[PDB]
Every structure is written in structure tokens, then in C-alpha cells.
Amino acid sequence: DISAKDLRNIMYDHLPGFGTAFHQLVQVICKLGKDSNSLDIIHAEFQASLAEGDSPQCALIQITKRVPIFQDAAPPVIHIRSRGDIPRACQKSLRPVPPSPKIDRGWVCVFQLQDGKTLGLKI
């Protein structure tokens, strides 16, 4: 039975670079997937997209569109001290939070900073 960590490493293994917006999307898919006992369907969708010839990035997006727990779901909020705690490769993908952000429209997560500032991570 695949764990979140294992699924994470599996997806990380398919991604170029480190600490990119897609890496954080993996973190989010795995955490929300674990909480909803869906690590198995998520792994299978991911593998099936690759087998279709989709890029891993495309496959991760397909998950957010085809696995039921992400459809119409708001991005998770993640409390961090400062903006520096966010990975360098993610810094340019940070945006003001729109009124109704959705994971299946590219909003991976919302970072809530200590002093009240918020930033969404966009793909």
C-alpha cells in the first residue's frame, strides 16, 4: 500500500528541477490525497497519463481535473513565517489571491504569512 511519501518521491522522480510550482503541486496532491484515502486512484491516474504519453506536468494537472476530490476544490492554506520560506523556483509563480481560487484552475495552494499577507501559487 503506497504511502504519501512514496507517491511524492515517485512524482518528484518525473519532474525536472527542484522546488518548482509542480513540486509543490505534488506535495498538495499527496497531502489532500492522503486525507481522502485516494493515494491509490491518484497514483493510477498519474501512471495512466504517462502511459498515454502525457508529460508529467500535464499528468499532474489531469489529476486535479479527473480525481473527484480536487474538482471544484479550493486550494489548501499553508501557514509559513515569511516569503523566504517559499522555494526559489516558486517565487515567480506567486500571485495575489483572487476571489475564488480553485485547484483545477491552477491555484496550487495559498501561503498565509505570519504578518497576515497571503499569496497563491499559480500554474
Ligand SMILES: O=C(O)Cc1ccc(N2C(=O)C(O)=C(C(=O)c3ccc(Cl)s3)[C@@H]2c2cc(Br)cs2)cc1
Ligand atoms: O505524508 C503525509 O502524512 C501527508 C503530508 C503531510 C505533510 C506534508 N507537508 C509538509 O510536511 C510540508 O512541509 C509541506 C509543504 O507543502 C510546505 C511547507 C512549507 C512550505 Cl513553504 S511548503 C507539506 C504540506 C502540504 C499541505 Br496541502 C499542507 S503542508 C505533505 C504531506
